Design a protein around this ligand. Structure first.
Ligand SMILES: C[S@@+](CC[C@H](N)C(=O)[O-])C[C@H]1O[C@@H](n2cnc3c(N)ncnc32)[C@H](O)[C@@H]1O
Ligand code: NA
Ligand code: NA
Ligand SMILES: [Zn+2]
Ligand SMILES: [Zn+2]
Lengths: 122, 297
């Protein structure tokens, strides 16, 4: 039943004042992208930075199994868009946040699926 | 001014000279480009290399096969691989490799000496950033180097599809005469210097459209001396300007034809198509690769 909880350990480390994982690979891009969370190519908007996904994955970086039966990674081989205010800790951002399964935007950082109904626009 | 270009390619006239080798002494040595905020030098360097490769007649088939040697770093990540995967069409297969373990965005990663890498398939593009740190720890008479370069020469002659291309990193001291000779086996070639790293003797030897035979007999010792003469006499201004316009960065998916022709069917019409980046000659079998494991107590 024993299972190493790397996610919780990194969050406790950060809460204690630990230095965030570094050398996440930031990409050059136009910053005129869709703003979606995880994409096949950099899609940062004006308020985000795009990073190589593998470099922002706690499991890839710590050389630990991915927390799922198949051991599949949703970041490796893709690009993750991180809000500029959180670009100092992309690993911590991907762990603490969830991608909306409907619009593909981060919950609380792009997803507008839960906003009051807009009046219809011509 | 060449400051708004991604870098500078060695003018063709240098290839026809017969210079004596001597020290590479760069006027702009020590200088540094203004890297965009939080951008690693290798992301900037690979971005400029890819910006320049976009201007060449690269074959870009569907299901393109790319192998990247020297993709690791002391950081434990693969900045260059992340740029290649951004640059290449999403359907391209990307395999990378390095002597030391690292975390990568490549489809597959092989750890170990490149001499331990095996593959039953041909590749469409070979990128190498391999460099031995002992090249600067002890300076030696500048002779042709025979470590990973011997493997690269063999890999080009056995595992590169006709019409395929290469970008192999060299420096004043990290070079190989046989690799320059192999540049004569491509429809065209050059030595490309990224503007962000123009203060270094580094260059990428780019072979464009592999013909599988020599169109020109090149003396590698003389050609490296010609390269040094160019670097010593035409200073390149450090510049990061091309990094700020990424609008036309992605490699265009040309959908280049791939055919499995025999060595006895390669005529002048075929060589002409290969030379224009309009044809890739190789089988399209399951891409299989591996790295030897040395077993001992
Ligand atoms: C300049 S570093 C590569 C930096 C990397 N391209 C990046 O994107 O940051 C050169 C690399 O060549 C690798 N290398 C040197 N000799 C090698 C060999 N014989 N086989 C494989 N890799 C080798 C080193 O381990 C080192 O990681
Ligand atoms: Na911050
Ligand atoms: Na891409
Ligand atoms: Zn991962
Ligand atoms: Zn949503």
């Amino acid at each position: 039943a024993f299972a190493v909880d790397a996610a919780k350990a990194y969050k406790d480390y950060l809460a204690s004042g630990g230095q965030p994982i570094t050398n996440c690979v930031k990409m050059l891009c136009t910053h005129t992208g869709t703003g979606q969370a995880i994409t096949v190519t950099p899609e940062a908007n004006m308020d985000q930075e795009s990073f190589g996904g593998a470099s922002c994955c706690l499991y890839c970086r710590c050389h630990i199994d991915h927390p799922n039966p198949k051991g599949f990674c949703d970041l490796k081989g893709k690009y993750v868009q991180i809000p500029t205010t959180c670009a100092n800790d992309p690993v911590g951002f991907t762990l603490k946040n969830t991608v909306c399964t409907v619009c593909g935007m981060w919950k609380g950082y792009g997803c507008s699926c839960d906003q009051l109904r807009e009046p219809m626009l011509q | 001014s060449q400051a708004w270009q991604p870098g500078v390619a060695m003018p063709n006239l240098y290839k026809m000279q017969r210079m004596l080798l001597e020290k590479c002494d760069l006027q702009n040595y020590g200088d540094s480009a203004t890297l965009p905020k939080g951008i690693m030098m290798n992301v900037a360097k690979y971005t400029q290399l890819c910006q320049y490769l976009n201007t060449l007649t690269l074959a870009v088939p569907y299901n393109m096969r790319v192998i990247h040697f020297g993709a690791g770093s002391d950081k434990g990540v693969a900045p260059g691989t992340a740029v290649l995967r951004q640059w290449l069409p999403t359907g391209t297969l990307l395999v990378d490799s390095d002597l030391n373990d690292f975390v990568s965005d490549a489809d597959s990663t092989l750890i170990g000496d490149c001499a331990t890498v095996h593959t039953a398939n041909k590749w469409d593009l070979i990128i190498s950033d391999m460099y031995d740190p002992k090249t600067k720890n002890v300076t030696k008479e500048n002779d042709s180097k025979e470590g990973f370069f011997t493997y690269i020469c063999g890999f080009i002659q056995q595992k590169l599809a006709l019409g395929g291309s290469v970008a192999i990193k060299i420096t004043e001291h990290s070079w190989n005469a046989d690799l320059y000779k192999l540049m004569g086996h491509f429809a065209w070639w050059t030595a490309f210097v990224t503007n962000v790293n123009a203060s270094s003797s580094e260059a990428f030897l780019i072979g464009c459209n592999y013909l599988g035979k020599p169109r020109e007999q090149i003396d590698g010792y003389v050609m490296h001396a010609n390269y040094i003469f160019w670097r010593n006499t035409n200073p390149i201004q450090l510049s990061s300007y091309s990094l700020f316009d990424m609008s036309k960065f992605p490699l265009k998916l040309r959908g280049t034809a791939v055919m499995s022709l025999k060595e006895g069917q390669i005529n002048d019409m075929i060589l002409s198509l290969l030379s224009k980046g309009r044809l890739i000659i190789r089988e399209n079998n399951r891409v299989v690769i591996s790295s030897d494991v040395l077993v001992n107590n």
